[PDB]
């Protein structure tokens, strides 16, 4: 799975995923399913931010934690928006809300509810994607146009297929279940 990951995702994403795992004492060489999952989440977040007009989104995911919180603080102080209890992934300047992006090998609603109960926010928008083409978002407000979401859905299905091709999909799907 480690070698698959390193040829599936761009080096910039792979590098960000390794840094994030080390900060949590996780070895990318051993917890390779987590490694794939983290890269996938990064790629989706970056694809999503590209789906809007040029200036639309502040990107929080992929930043160093301290600077991430600094940018979050800048947004909150300048917009009035409630400060999230956990680091969100993007801030949407058009809709004026933080966005938590999820990617799940489980059902979208199960994951959605876990995320909603965790963050405890009446403001932060939640948008969940699956490896089956399903999506679920706060109030059925999907933020992006259909085209931008579809591209993301397509990419996730390709990753799933590329994994299944190598006999890695079953283990990858099961890993999230065991973790939860
Ligand atoms: Mn996140
Ligand atoms: Mn996320």
Author numbering: 1 to 50, 50A, 50B, 50C, 73 to 196, 196A, 196B, 196C
Authors' text:
The RdRp is a heterotrimeric complex comprising subunits PA, PB1, and PB2 that associates with the 3′ and 5′ ends of each RNA genome segment. Translation of viral mRNAs by the host ribosome requires 5′ capping, and the necessary mRNA caps are cleaved or “snatched” from host pre-mRNAs. This “cap-snatching” mechanism begins with the binding of PB2 to the cap of a host pre-mRNA, followed by the cleavage of the pre-mRNA by the endonuclease functionality. Two groups found that the endonuclease activity resides not in PB1 as previously suggested but in an independently folded N-terminal domain of PA (PAN). Here, we present crystal structures of PAN from strain A/Vietnam/1203/2004 (H5N1) in complex with six known or predicted inhibitors that allow us to precisely describe their interactions with the PAN active site.
Importantly, the active site residues are virtually superimposable, two metal ions are clearly present, and the dose-dependent endonuclease activity is unaffected by the truncations. We eventually modeled two Mn2+ ions into the active sites of all of our structures for the following reasons. ΔLoop–Apo crystals soaked in a solution containing only 5 mM MnCl2 revealed strong electron density in both metal sites. Second, refinements of all our structures consistently favored Mn2+ over Mg2+ ions to account for the observed electron densities. ΔLoop–Apo and move to 3.8–4.0 Å apart when an inhibitor is bound. Our data suggest that the inhibitor-bound form of PAN represents the enzyme-substrate complex stage in which the metals are separated by about 4.0 Å. PAN contains a large, deep active site (over 3000 Å3) with several ordered water molecules, 17 of which are found in at least three of the four PAN molecules in the asymmetric unit.
